[PDB]
Design a protein around this ligand. Structure first.
Ligand SMILES: [Mg+2]
Lengths: 49, 48, 97, 49, 49, 707
């Protein structure tokens, strides 16, 4: 069901730590996403998506 | 209580407080057989 | 935008400055425009654009006031980059858990 | 000139200089006896002297 | 989840997450997001035994 | 609706459609640039965020502006045209000459400040009744001498056209452009159109002080939200996100009361005298045990008697705090007394006056047991319980002994205490001050906060330290700029709500301005509530003392507006009557002779083309008579109504028709209206004055004595 291993291109071996790999892959590019404003003042930022 | 007002730590208290076991560490170990140094480009090396 | 387009059109295909970018080896056309075309708009300490842009290019050399207003974003970025990692680490720890 | 100040005065359940001084004294010195002499003295010795 | 069921809510979650990651210029394979989304819907609440 | 009007409406529709097309093009460009910036900005992170936020803010503004883009139009004496809307739209390739002016722009100031007597170089003012992207119709107003050739639903210009006009305009301008910012009272007689002046005054005041009222909000009080409707029409942002409307029955949040109360009960329940009654009634709940209570500690039997409860109540009442707060003093003293009695008998004869090491520990043990004791707490709840306004009033009305204790009259008896009326709402609101809260605190929320802050601290600890960095040079770290508490709060729900709904759900909210319509209906307690909910004393009050149907309504403005702002409120009364004919005015004056010996009425300076009419009703012909009348009138032209008691199916009760004007009115059987309580004469006066062009009367045997 998981299928090809992204790192090597072959079918995943029994015992792969797929969960931590997925977590790291999702979390690594988190710095490129836009975030809430860092300033303390102002109104709540939910008005603008 | 004993001396002062501090209570006496019971046996089960060895497994409950912030200090004890069943507890993880967010800080990492310091490991022997390790070193550190500046890196420079070696263009004659192979990928391994 | 128009100044950037004109600059992109003008440069010869074999000029090193634009050859470095077009080959994908390094950089992007925004940096080339800033270096040669014009710096453009800059932000206040609050993060809002200043109406008057920096019409000079680093090849020509910014004036005193243009440089002073430009320093705002440079100073802001140092703290912005440091603060950006906290949210990423938070989400990464959640996902790992 | 301001309605909010007049409203605060209307809702202020304190009358006279001595009572206000006693209130301030008991506020700043909750554990001390409510003597009038100290109640008058501390305020003068806190900011104005 | 209530209207369509567990299958469609997982597809919806994966689509929504990948939509943000695509719009922000990040490329992650759907399987990494699926690994995380699977863990979210592993329980069933009992209403009557 | 002349063909010229249709052509003008079509032209305005075409112009608004062009404006909307330009708006859609701008939206598309902004969205495309926003997507491109999010995807491949290629610059520094700060610059990318700045551009993205600017584009998102612009897109949100465009989204907000979609509903009702254009408000109205202004015509200058120079023949130039100005269009007022929610956004500023300018033609880039035509030297930026405006196609639409933001309502906040200085050039749009005359739209709100201009008046007929003192125009700001403007000839005519127009307003579009927008509905989505479509304009249903528009109303015109001449800022000068009336012409009589314009179109508007109110038809006020036509009536004015049919000096006296200069004097009326000057008086209206004097009312509208008053520089006062406190309590203002407007009371014009019937047919004077004081409603239009009130709406114009509200618009002017809200525009002038908009910058200091966009956060406090505006509260509209009255039978119908028509004032809120106008505020939304002319100030859609404030109306949509800042204006809250509450009928006098909806003062208490979440309790939509509609039932009325009899005059005998309402007249007393609406007076300030009830404040003493409420204070006495809650004091009654501070009762005593008729017989001693066996508290029955786990080891030694214990007894509470009437005298210890007496002393505890004396202490609690001495403290003077609200009921739920003096509960602490009452329970504390009762617990101390019971603990002393129990300790004296547990350590029989031994421990008395010994050092702290024994007596204090015994006291602590006894108090700890008491705090968990079920029957002791049940007893403490039997006398001096925790109270709520609903429970207090329900158990006050339903019992016949507590009313005598509280000093209330025998008239406000009712079998069911939970049948709330509009008169009970202010008492429910008031009782909150008397009762208060028992120092409520939350425990699960604190645990959640602690856990989240600890998780944020762990996240920060997970990051690399400065001691062992591997970068080429030292630099700012996250730990140097943010702490665990701030990081944890960064990911919480942070729920956000509109100001309108946010204030509507809060009892303690203080509003920036209060608008009251038909103010004569409000009683002393309603005014107390409203003045409690607006400490700035910024009020716009409209009504007529002679037209109240609520027996508890204000007898005069000075009786109501003098216990809060004595000598500071401004009063202005409009004089001339033009919205109604001379014959209707004479009939109204004839009815008015029964109210006051003098009753200075608004003189009429206009007469209708046809006089009123009256007829008898015999052998139950009203059923077909009303149908024939409405068929004849509605089919011809204009809006016609039938006014009478609900006993006739085809009658609109006076309670609903007060705030409307009609071309034709048919009042049926005025005797029944005159028999409707002490205010029957006022009801008939109102119904007769509703007529603007033609009035019909049906009576059983003879016309009322006055007529
Ligand atoms: Mg480096």
């Amino acid at each position: 069901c998981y299928g090809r291993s992204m790192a090597t291109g072959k079918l995943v071996d029994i015992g792969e730590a797929v969960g931590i790999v997925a977590a790291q892959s999702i979390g690594e590019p988190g710095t490129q996403l836009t975030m809430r404003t860092f300033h303390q003042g102002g109104v709540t930022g939910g008005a603008d998506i | 209580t004993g001396p002062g007002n501090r209570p006496l730590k019971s046996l089960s208290d060895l497994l409950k407080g912030k200090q004890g076991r069943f507890r993880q560490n967010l800080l990492g170990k310091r490991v022997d057989y390790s070193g550190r140094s500046v890196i420079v480009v070696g263009p004659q090396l192979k990928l391994h | 935008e128009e100044v950037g387009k004109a600059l992109e059109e003008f440069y010869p295909a074999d000029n090193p400055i634009i050859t470095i970018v077009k080959s994908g080896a390094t950089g992007n056309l925004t940096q080339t425009r800033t270096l040669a075309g014009m710096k453009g708009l800059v932000t206040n300490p609050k993060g809002e654009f200043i109406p008057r842009p920096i019409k000079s290019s680093f090849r020509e050399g910014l004036t005193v006031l243009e440089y002073f207003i430009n320093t705002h974003g440079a100073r802001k970025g140092l703290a912005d980059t440091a603060l950006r990692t906290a949210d990423s680490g938070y989400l990464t720890r959640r996902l790992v858990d | 000139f301001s309605e909010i100040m007049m409203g605060t005065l209307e809702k202020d359940t304190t009358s006279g200089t001595d009572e206000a001084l006693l209130d301030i004294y008991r506020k700043l010195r909750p554990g001390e006896p409510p003597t009038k002499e100290s109640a008058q003295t501390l305020l003068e010795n806190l900011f104005f002297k | 989840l209530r209207v369509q069921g567990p299958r469609e809510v997982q597809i919806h979650l994966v689509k929504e997450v990948q939509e943000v990651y695509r719009a922000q210029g990040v490329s992650i394979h759907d399987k990494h997001i699926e690994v995380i989304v699977r863990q979210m819907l592993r329980r069933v609440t009992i209403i009557d035994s | 609706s002349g063909r010229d009007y249709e052509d003008e409406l079509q032209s305005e529709r075409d112009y608004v459609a062009g404006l909307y097309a330009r708006l859609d093009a701008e939206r598309a460009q902004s969205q495309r640039r926003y997507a491109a910036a999010l995807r491949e900005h290629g610059g520094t992170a700060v610059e990318r965020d700045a551009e993205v936020r600017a584009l998102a803010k612009d897109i949100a503004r465009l989204n907000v502006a979609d509903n009702g883009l254009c408000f109205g139009r202004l015509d200058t004496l120079d023949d130039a045209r100005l269009y007022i809307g929610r956004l500023g739209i300018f033609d880039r390739d035509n030297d930026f000459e405006p196609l639409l002016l933001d309502w906040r722009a200085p050039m749009a100031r005359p739209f709100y400040v201009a008046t007929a007597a003192n125009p700001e170089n403007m000839r005519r003012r127009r307003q579009f009744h927008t509905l989505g992207r479509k304009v249903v119709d528009f109303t015109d107003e001449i800022l000068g001498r009336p012409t009589g050739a314009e179109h508007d639903a109110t038809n006020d210009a036509a009536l004015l056209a049919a000096d006296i006009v200069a004097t009326i305009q000057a008086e209206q301008d004097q009312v509208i452009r008053l520089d006062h910012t406190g309590v203002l009272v407007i009371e014009g007689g019937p047919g004077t159109g004081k409603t239009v002046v009130a709406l114009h005054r509200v618009a002017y005041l809200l525009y002038t002080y908009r910058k200091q009222m966009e956060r406090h909000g505006v509260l509209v009080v009255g039978p119908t939200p028509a004032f809120l409707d106008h505020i939304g029409r002319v100030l859609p942002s404030l109306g949509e996100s800042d204006a809250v409307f509450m009928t006098p029955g909806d003062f208490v949040p979440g309790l939509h009361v509609t039932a009325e109360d009899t005059p005998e009960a309402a007249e007393v329940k609406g007076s300030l005298k009830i404040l003493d009654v409420l204070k006495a009634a809650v004091a009654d709940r501070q009762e005593l045990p008729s017989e001693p209570i066996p508290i029955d500690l786990s080891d030694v039997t214990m007894r509470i008697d009437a005298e210890t409860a007496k002393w505890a109540r004396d202490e609690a009442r001495k403290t003077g705090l609200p009921h739920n707060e003096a509960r602490a003093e009452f329970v504390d003293v009762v617990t101390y007394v019971v603990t002393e009695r129990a300790v004296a008998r547990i350590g029989r004869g031994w421990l008395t006056r010994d050092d702290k090491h024994a007596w204090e520990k015994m006291r602590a043990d006894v108090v700890g047991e008491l705090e968990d004791h079920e029957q002791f707490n049940a007893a403490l709840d039997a006398l001096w319980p925790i109270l709520t306004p609903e429970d207090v009033l329900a158990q006050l009305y339903t019992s016949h002994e507590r009313l005598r204790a509280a000093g209330a009259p025998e008239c406000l008896w009712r079998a069911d205490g939970e049948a709330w009326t509009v008169s009970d709402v202010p008492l429910l609101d008031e009782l909150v001050d008397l009762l208060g809260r028992n120092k409520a605190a939350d425990e699960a929320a604190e645990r959640e906060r602690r856990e989240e802050e600890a998780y944020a601290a762990g996240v920060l600890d997970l990051m690399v330290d400065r001691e062992d960095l591997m970068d080429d040079e030292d630099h700012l770290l996250a730990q140097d700029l943010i702490d665990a508490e701030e990081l944890a709060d960064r990911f919480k729900e942070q729920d956000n709500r509109e100001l309108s709904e946010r204030a509507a759900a809060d009892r303690e909210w203080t509003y920036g301005h209060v608008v009251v319509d038909e103010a004569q209906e409000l009683s002393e307690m309603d005014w107390r509530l409203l003045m409690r909910r607006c400490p700035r004393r910024s009020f716009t009050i409209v009504g007529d003392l002679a037209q109240r149907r609520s027996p508890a309504g204000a007898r005069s403005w000075g009786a109501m507006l003098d216990s809060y702002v004595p000598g500071r409120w401004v009063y202005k009364s409009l004089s001339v009557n033009y919205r109604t004919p001379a014959e209707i005015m004479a009939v109204a004056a004839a009815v008015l002779a029964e109210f006051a010996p003098d009753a200075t009425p608004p003189d009429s300076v206009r007469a209708c083309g046809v006089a009123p009419w009256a007829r008898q009703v015999t052998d139950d012909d009203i059923a077909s008579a009303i149908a024939e009348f409405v068929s004849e009138e509605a089919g011809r032209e204009g809006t016609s109504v039938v006014i009478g008691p609900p006993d006739v199916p085809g009658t609109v009760p006076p309670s609903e028709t007060k705030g409307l004007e009609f071309d034709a009115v048919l009042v049926v059987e005025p005797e029944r209206i005159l028999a409707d309580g002490p205010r029957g004469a006022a009801e008939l006066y109102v119904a007769l004055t509703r007529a603007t062009q033609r009035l019909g009367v049906l009576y059983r045997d003879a016309l009322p004595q006055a007529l």
